[PDB]
Structures are given as C-alpha cells and as structure tokens.
Amino acid sequence: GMTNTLKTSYQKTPYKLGGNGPRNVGVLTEALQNIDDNLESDIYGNGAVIEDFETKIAKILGKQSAVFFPSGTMAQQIALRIWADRKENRRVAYHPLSHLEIHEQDGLKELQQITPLLLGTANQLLTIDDIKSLREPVSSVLIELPQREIGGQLPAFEELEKISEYCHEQGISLHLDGARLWEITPFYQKSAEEICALFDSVYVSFYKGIGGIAGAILAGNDDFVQEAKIWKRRYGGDLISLYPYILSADYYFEKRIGKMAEYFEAAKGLAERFNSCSGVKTVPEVPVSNMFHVYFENSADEIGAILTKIQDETGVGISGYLQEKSADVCAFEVSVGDAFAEIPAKNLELVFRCLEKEL
C-alpha cells in the first residue's frame, strides 16, 4: 500500500531534506581517523578519554561536573530520582508528550515508582500557569527545549526565566531535557551555559542535531553527578569501555556545533517554501530551530502518492512516512542537518514546483 511505496521511494533518493546522511559504519570509521590506536580505553567511568570529555561538556554547559551516559533514557530517569530523594517527593511534572512519558516503555514509573503529573495539554506548550495549577507539590519539573512532539516549539526566553524563578521560590528542582539544546541557541541568542544556568540539572544528546552515533551527558553540581554515577552502575550503564561513543560524540560535536545557526536559517527557508504551498502549513509556522512539522489538508494515502511521485522524479527524499492526524489531515517531521546543503538547487526548486502543481 501507500506506506511501503513511500518508504521504498524515500529510501531510493540520493538526496534528503532531513538528517545527516546514512547511519552506517563509515560514521564511526571517519571519527577514528585522527585517533591513535594506542589511545587507552576508559575503564568503568575513569580514564582521560572519558574524564576529559565530561570536563569539556561540563564547562560548555556551565556546570561543576558531568557524567557520560550510554543513553538519555537512563540519564533522565536517574536525574528525577535524585531530585525526588532530595525533596522526599516521588511526584514530578512535565509536558504530556515528554520522552519519559511516551518513549521509554514507562521506565520512570516502573523502575523509579515516580508519578508524573502532566502539564497543560498534549497539543501546546506548557506554561507557568500549568505549574501553578498543580494539585499537589512536586520534587521537580522537567522542561524539553524545544518541545519536539509539537514541532519543536519554544517559550519566549523571559518565560523560561519566570518558570526558573518560581521553581526556585517553591523549592522545585528544574531539569532540562536538552536532547536538542545545541539546535536552539541561534534562536534564543543565548549560549548553552546561559540556557542551562536556569536549571539544576541538564541532559544533552550527541546523536540528534550533532549527528553522532549515540550517547548522552548529564551535568550539574558535583554532589548530584556523584549520586548519578552510583545509579549508572545500578542501571548497567557503567560499561567497561564507552570510548566508541565518547570519541564519536566529541568528533561530531566539533564537526557540527558551528553549524547550528546555518541549520536554523536553512530550516526557516525550507518552512517558507512549504507554507507557500496551498493546503500545506508548518508547525511552528516559523521554525525556532532546525526542525518543524509539515501538515497537509489531505489524507496520508493521498499525500503519500504525491510525495512518492515527486521523490521519484527529483531524487529528493521528503519523508519516508506520514502520520495520520485526522480523517483528511496528515503530517511529518523535518530535522535539517548536513544532507540539506548537498541538494542541488535545481532539484530542490523542482520539488516545490511539483508540490505546488500536485495539490
């Protein structure tokens, strides 16, 4: 049906609007080009290769220390448990579509017996008013900048300041799900340190906008990080050797961190072209990062046929899937990376000329 035809069409395209190209073994071998084969492996959380990377990212985030984790899934459940223990309160609060709530097979609930109170509604940004309306106290609030499931939306920076100030006054710990932190500094015109300064703890990824292989850093005060390392061993995350992910994380960080503004500008240019099409809009209308969602006023079956024809005729991958939203509405996500800049101008123009012609 539509699903498989679109998938196949997308997979065959030489060019892609989204991403950083194929996730293949070459991503790792490229990262190892400048590394000495005699470089010693880290050993259960210790050693220059891991310690130097932790110290470096901690300094970039303006925190006392950091711990390298195999995943954000592990790291964030642990962060919330530490704050629950400090406050003797197993309730937390976050957006209904937090990664913890929907993408971790209920790990936070099942492994930590933490009860998440959902803030606002699934379709919009949470606000300070939602926090003020909580019917019981919480140990922490978790904020995801930007809110990926609603298209990568952000509150005004001044509103994040007000949330931070209120949490400080009420003794509520504030944790940053910064999976896509690097991608938002251009819009906010704030450094990573400035944004993270409003939070007690922060998690950042190296495989999202950075385009590395896998891995995460959790950062905060020394005492906090030391407790996180104990939990890391409990979770089976204190692997003997994490260098394959540390080296690749550091390589791709240095390769792509300077491109965040470029990806933001590119995403905005692309969104303008989508919005110019009849029956097509983006959310947000003007991207505030390298990502956005594209919505259509037609069913997924109908749009899939159009996208397949266009991908086949231009060689430019638009999307490998379409999410059904209502009877006659569907959508997909775009995250701009290195692939966008490789699309020849003619092919890119043709995609939209064709899109405008088919709908």
Give the interface with a second copy as residue ranges (CB under 8 A): 22-29, 32, 35-41, 43, 69-75, 77, 104-107, 110-111, 207, 213-214, 230-231, 233-245, 247
**Residue 223 sits in the site that holds Cl ion (CB under 5 A):** yes
Pick 207 or 264: Cβ nearer a second copy: 207
**Residue 55 sits in the site that holds Cl ion (CB under 5 A):** no
> What one-letter code names the amino acid at 39?
L
Least distance (Å) from a second copy to the CB of residue 177?
14
Contacted by 24, from Cl ion, a second copy, none: CB < 5 to 8 Å by type = a second copy
Cross-sheet strand order for the sheet of 91-94: 65-69, 216-220, 201-205, 173-178, 140-144, 91-94, 115-118
Least distance (Å) from Cl ion to the CB of residue 349?
54
Pick 224 or 231: Cβ nearer Cl ion: 224
Q: Which two tokens stand for residue 304?
A: 């899939």
Q: Which residues contact 208 (CB under 8 A, 6 or more apart)?
A: 179, 180, 183, 335
Closest CA to 126 of 94, 156, 161, 173: 94
Least distance (Å) from a second copy to the CB of residue 260?
21
Pick 241 or 298: Cβ nearer a second copy: 241
H/E stretch holding 191 reads none
Contacted by 251, from a second copy, Cl ion, none: CB < 5 to 8 Å by type = none
Contacted by 230, from Cl ion, a second copy, none: CB < 5 to 8 Å by type = a second copy
Least distance (Å) from Cl ion to the CB of residue 83?
9
**Residue 340 sits in the site that holds Cl ion (CB under 5 A):** no
Contacted by 2, from a second copy, Cl ion, none: CB < 5 to 8 Å by type = none
Question: What are the two backbone dihedrals, phi and then psi, of residue 220, each rounded to the nearest 5 degrees?
Answer: 170, -155
Q: Which two tokens stand for residue 290?
A: 């390298």
Least distance (Å) from a second copy to the CB of residue 67?
13
Pick 40 or 223: Cβ nearer Cl ion: 223
Contacted by 269, from a second copy, Cl ion, none: CB < 5 to 8 Å by type = none
User: What pairing do the DSSP bridges indicate for beta strands 323-326 and 329-335?
Assistant: antiparallel
Cα–Cα distance measured from residue 261 to residue 264, given in angstroms and rounded to the nearest whole number: 5
Number of residues engaging Cl ion in binding (CB under 5 A): 3
Cα–Cα distance measured from residue 219 to residue 94, given in angstroms and rounded to the nearest whole number: 19
Choice from 11, 105, 191, 221 touching Cl ion (CB under 5 A): 221
Pick 72 or 155: Cβ nearer a second copy: 72
Cα–Cα distance measured from residue 190 to residue 185, given in angstroms and rounded to the nearest whole number: 5
**Residue 224 sits in the site that holds Cl ion (CB under 5 A):** yes
Which conformational region is residue 120 in: left (phi greater than 0), alpha (psi within -120 to 50 degrees), or beta?
A: left
| Residue nearest Cl ion, Cβ-based | 221
Pick 7 or 86: Cβ nearer Cl ion: 86
Closest CA to 82 of 92, 71, 69: 92
Pick 54 or 130: Cβ nearer a second copy: 54
Cα–Cα distance measured from residue 168 to residue 174, given in angstroms and rounded to the nearest whole number: 8
